[PDB]
Design a protein around this nucleic acid. Structure first.
Ligand SMILES: Cc1cn([C@H]2C[C@H](O)[C@@H](COP(=O)(O)OP(=O)(O)OP(=O)(O)O)O2)c(=O)[nH]c1=O
Ligand SMILES: [Mg+2]
Length: 980
DNA sequence: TGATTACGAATTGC
DNA sequence: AATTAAGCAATTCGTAATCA
């Protein structure tokens, strides 16, 4: 009415607008960039793409004549063709035509003279008949290729070499201008991808938020009940790579003062507000729609209110660019309820939204959680202050209630300001973390749409990339399937190897750790762990060796059974390399380049002091590059992870077994080689290996120091020299080890890498060590203390244990001279524990709060009694009549904080748990002895495990557990003795 | 009534 | 007329059942 998309994009980019108008009039090739994808199942299959032109115009491009087909193996016999077509038509399925071709299977190894196998491809119209035919043929027991039953645009993208998340060049099109949209009709032989670097791109993203009200005190509004009401919606538009806005709108009910920044629309009813929201959405036509926590509170609220008022059809049809749809179809198809999104290996979240064609909905909270999966606080303030942005953009709810009760224009203006800022913060986060281009690159690399890049995990991306590389091979075309097959067994196969540490504190010999770089991918490259190079029979392996090939033998144990196999090597020939090695080789170069850039950035940063204003930006850029290379690393490891997954089409147990066995063999070989040279090895884990230097290297500096006055500065100089010679010797040792490995295997893929020097160091057990880190130059007056799994870095831990652990750890590394007093670890632990238990007046009501997750599906024992107790208390409170919202159950999958108090006359956790607010209201003094005896004793016993008096005789097998029990008992007796 | 054990759940390190 | 989801090794706590 006042300002639409076309006028804005013409005002912003006039020259590009004039250019695009000229090309449209002349009917010249254009550029297009997609965001959203939609397709039709019944009837003729046409693919819909919604996106942007160069200047900013919104366009929709429909592709017709996309072939629909799928492949089966069988044979070329005409009798087979007739039999298959008779079977297919016997179940009321209509097909178009049949074709024959030749392809190489993916499973098994064949010689050159019998490599190619026949295939029959069946064509179809509409996806429904194709899916039914695939299911029927697979159930009948026929091998099939292609085989993508869930989504079909992935197959189109991987077959036509047309990324759905990049620029596309339009040639020889049909054009029709309809209102604000530009209908484009194309044909697959048209198009093609844009190889060069495209322009800056111009897409529109709208961030929105809402504010609601309820008449009953202290309750979150619920759409199901009457009254309540949603009473403000504010929205703002932006480019895809910019923070400055283009337009902003506020829709409200109560009167408010006019503001120069935004436009205000005044309604007089709840229906009017939703209608105006839909109208403004239709006029702007966002390409992306965003809001914070909108998938759990906002969208269901609007949808439920609309159904209550019965205006869902109008809103959906005005927002959507697709054709008319009825209410039942909207409810069944375009309204998603309870969708599962994966965050970590043991976490998931539930999302629900409304999907209008022509716009993609994105939740900022999901992206932030996926970026930082180990964060206890998951609110806007926490994520906003983590990245370095300005926090404190929130408003109390009671103040909002009072302001709505008063019905004053200034208060409504203030709440409008706050919700506008809330809308802005989402775009701030999205631009700061650079989210959309990263997912864009992932989709380009994996041949997948952006919706999948936002709402899905990485296994299917791996499968799609493997199939895409297989079908485009230089020496043929390889057929791959997506449907899993074979019997599913329960169990685990052996893997990894950990070396028993020489426990204790080392303050005289520097220790250096060397590890393999990309161990498992390198093993795959070196030994050809590929499905097409696998031999299962012994006779075949014997014959292949007789002819003159080279094979790798694998054997291990699984479920009281021997698993045995062979693989074929490539002896440094490009023609003989497998498919997994090709993909991993292509992926490794990107990580190498990013690592070089990271090293250059670190070198540049090392020359800048902390006081310079530019230090924070350099730190941020360094962190982002590190995150990118870690993201590549996890994607690379997902290949091995999926190779052993029981639900994937690429399941092959011998591959994973051989990978793990070869890792163990290489680690043991390097261990023996280093031992037989005079060095001492203190630790090992999977690939990392920690070594110490001989005693003859430091003779000169030792003799020089022994003839001096023996002051502290002299010992500091001696330590500096020790570390320098340690690095100098370790470089040569690494070079010799790499040469030995290269001679052993015959290939340069496997290689060891230098990390750092740890001096002084302490090993408290398996997977538990700490020390001071030296990278390139010695430096001792630092506070960083490495730390790897010392139980003070976990999630559900109180501040008390962290403080005690830090106090103990930072005291054992103070660089004491040999001639001075060198105190053991036991006295440090005892002194810290005694100063903790005694003098308890140093702890406040902040060191005892601990957080835990509430998962109803999981059983647990302690939380499920606390929940029942709170439910009974709530029922008792509601009986007489009182407020009971203080004891509301947390949302499933979320974490809650709690404290432990004293219960009079029990003796169980869960009968003493209380909420933080309830405890603060009613004092409820804390039991400190419970915290001590249940949490500090284990850590303190782990520190002093190494001592001799706790050791078992030679008969006991598991010495570590026995020693831990004895240390815990000894410390328990000590703590009972010091203060009853 | 005490000591000991077994199994699920939680969380880190590769 | 409906559907996701990489692997294993190692330690620590918490409650109920069985054993002297
Ligand atoms: C981190 C990680 C490792 N692993 C396994 C496979 C790896 O080969 C093995 C050891 O990996 P690391 O030695 O931790 O790392 P890397 O060798 O892959 O790379 P870099 O040295 O540059 O850090 O751990 C997984 O299976 N999944 C994972 O998520
Ligand atoms: Mg490594």
């Amino acid at each position: 009415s006042i300002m639409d998309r076309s006028e804005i994009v013409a005002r912003e980019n006039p020259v590009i607008t004039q250019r695009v108008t000229n090309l449209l009039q002349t009917n010249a090739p254009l550029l297009f960039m997609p965001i959203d994808i939609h397709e039709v199942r019944y009837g003729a299959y046409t693919l819909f793409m919604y996106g942007s032109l160069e200047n900013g115009y919104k366009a929709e491009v429909r592709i017709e004549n996309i072939p629909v087909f799928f492949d089966v193996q069988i044979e070329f016999n005409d009798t087979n063709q007739l039999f298959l077509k008779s079977l297919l038509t016997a179940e009321n399925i209509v097909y178009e035509r049949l074709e024959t071709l030749t392809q190489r299977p993916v499973m098994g190894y064949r010689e050159k003279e019998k490599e190619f196998a026949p295939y029959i491809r069946i064509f179809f119209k509409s996806l429904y008949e194709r899916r039914k035919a695939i299911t029927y043929l697979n159930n009948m027991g026929y091998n099939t290729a292609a085989d993508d039953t869930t989504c079909y645009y992935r197959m189109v993208s991987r077959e036509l070499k047309l990324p759905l998340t990049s620029w596309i060049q339009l040639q020889h099109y049909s054009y029709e201008p309809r209102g604000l949209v530009h209908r484009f009709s194309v044909t697959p032989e048209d198009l093609v991808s844009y190889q060069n670097d495209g322009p800056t791109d111009h897409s529109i993203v709208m961030a929105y938020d809402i504010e609601t009200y309820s008449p009953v005190k202290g309750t979150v509004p619920d759409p199901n009940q009457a009254n309540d009401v949603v009473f403000m919606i504010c929205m703002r538009i932006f480019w895809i790579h910019s923070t400055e806005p283009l337009a902003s709108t506020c829709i409200t009910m109560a009167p408010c003062k006019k503001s120069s920044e935004w436009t205000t629309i005044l309604c007089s009813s709840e229906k009017n507000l939703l209608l105006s929201f839909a109208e403004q959405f239709s006029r702007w036509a966002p390409d992306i729609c965003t809001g914070f926590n909108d998938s759990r509170y906002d969208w269901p609220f609007i949808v439920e209110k609309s159904m209550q008022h019965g205006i869902l059809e109008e809103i959906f049809n005005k927002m959507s660019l697709f054709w008319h749809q009825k209410l039942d179809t909207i409810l069944k198809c375009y309204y998603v309820k309870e969708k599962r999104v994966k965050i970590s290996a043991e976490k998931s979240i539930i999302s629900s939204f409304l999907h209008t064609p022509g716009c993609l909905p994105i939740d900022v909270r999901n992206m932030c959680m996926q970026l930082y999966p180990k964060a206890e606080k998951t609110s806007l303030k926490a994520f906003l202050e983590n990245c370095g942005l300005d926090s404190k953009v929130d408003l109390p709810y009671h103040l909002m209630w009072k302001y709505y009760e008063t019905r004053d224009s200034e208060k409504i203006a203030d709440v409008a300001y706050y919700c506008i800022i809330d809308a802005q913060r989402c775009q701030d986060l999205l631009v700061r973390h650079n989210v959309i281009p990263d997912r864009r690159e992932v989709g380009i690399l994996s041949y997948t749409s952006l919706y999948d890049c936002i709402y899905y995990a990485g296994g299917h991306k791996v499968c799609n990339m493997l199939i895409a590389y297989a079908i485009h091979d230089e020496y043929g075309r390889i057929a791959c399937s997506t449907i899993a097959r074979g019997k599913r067994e329960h169990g685990k196969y052996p893997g990894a190897f950990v070396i028993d540490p020489v426990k204790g504190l080392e303050q005289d010999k520097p220790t250096t750790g060397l590890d393999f770089a990309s161990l498992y991918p390198s093993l795959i490259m070196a030994y050809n762990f590929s499905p097409e190079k696998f031999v299962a029979s012994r006779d075949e392996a014997n014959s292949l060796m007789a002819k003159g090939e080279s094979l790798h033998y694998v054997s291990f144990h699984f479920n009281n059974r021997l698993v045995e196999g062979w693989f074929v090597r490539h002896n440094n020939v490009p023609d003989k390399m497998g498919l997994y090695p090709k993909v991993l080789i292509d992926l490794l170069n990107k990580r190498t380049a990013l690592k070089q850039e990271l090293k250059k950035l670190g070198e540049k940063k090392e020359c800048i002091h902390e006081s310079h204003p530019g230090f924070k930006e350099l730190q941020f850029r360094h962190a982002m590059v590190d995150a990118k290379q870690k993201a590549l690393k996890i994607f690379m490891n997902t290949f091995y992870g999926e190779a052993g997954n029981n639900l994937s089409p690429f399941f092959l147990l011998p591959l994973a077994g051989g990978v793990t066995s070869s890792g163990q063999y290489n680690l043991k070989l390097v261990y023996n080689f280093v031992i037989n040279k005079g060095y001492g090895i203190k630790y090992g884990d999977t690939d990392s290996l920690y070594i110490t230097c001989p005693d003859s290297l430091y003779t000169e500096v030792t003799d020089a120091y022994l003839n001096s006055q023996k002051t502290i500065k002299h010992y500091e100089q001696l330590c500096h020299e020790k570390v320098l010679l340690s690095m100098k010797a370790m470089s040569t040792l690494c070079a010799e080890v790499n040469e030995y490995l290269r001679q052993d295997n015959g290939t340069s893929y496997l290689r060891m890498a230098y990390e750092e020097v740890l001096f002084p160091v302490c090993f408290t057990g398996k997977k538990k060590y700490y020390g001071i880190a030296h990278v390139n130059t010695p430096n001792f007056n630092t506070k960083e203390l490495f730390i790897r799994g010392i139980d003070i870095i976990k999630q559900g831990q109180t501040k008390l244990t962290k403080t005690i652990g830090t106090r103990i750890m930072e005291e054992s590394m103070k660089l004491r001279r040999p001639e001075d007093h060198r105190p053991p670890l036991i006295e440090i632990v005892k002194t810290v524990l005694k100063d903790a238990v005694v003098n308890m007046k140093q702890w406040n009501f902040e060191d005892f709060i601990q957080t835990d997750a509430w998962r109803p599906d999981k059983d647990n024992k302690a939380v499920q009694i606390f929940m029942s107790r709170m439910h009974a208390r709530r029922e008792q409170l509601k009986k007489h009549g009182a407020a009971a919202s203080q004891f509301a159950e947390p949302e499933p999958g979320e974490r809650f904080s709690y404290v432990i108090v004293e219960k009079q006359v029990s003796s169980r956790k869960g009968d003493k748990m209380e909420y933080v607010s309830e405890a603060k209201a009613k004092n409820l003094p804390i039991d400190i002895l419970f915290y001590i005896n249940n949490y500090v004793l284990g850590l303190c016993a782990r520190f002093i495990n190494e001592n001799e008096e706790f050791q078992p005789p030679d008969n006991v097998s598991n010495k570590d557990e026995y020693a831990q029990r004895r240390a815990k008992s000894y410390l328990q007796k000590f703590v009972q003795s010091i203060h009853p």
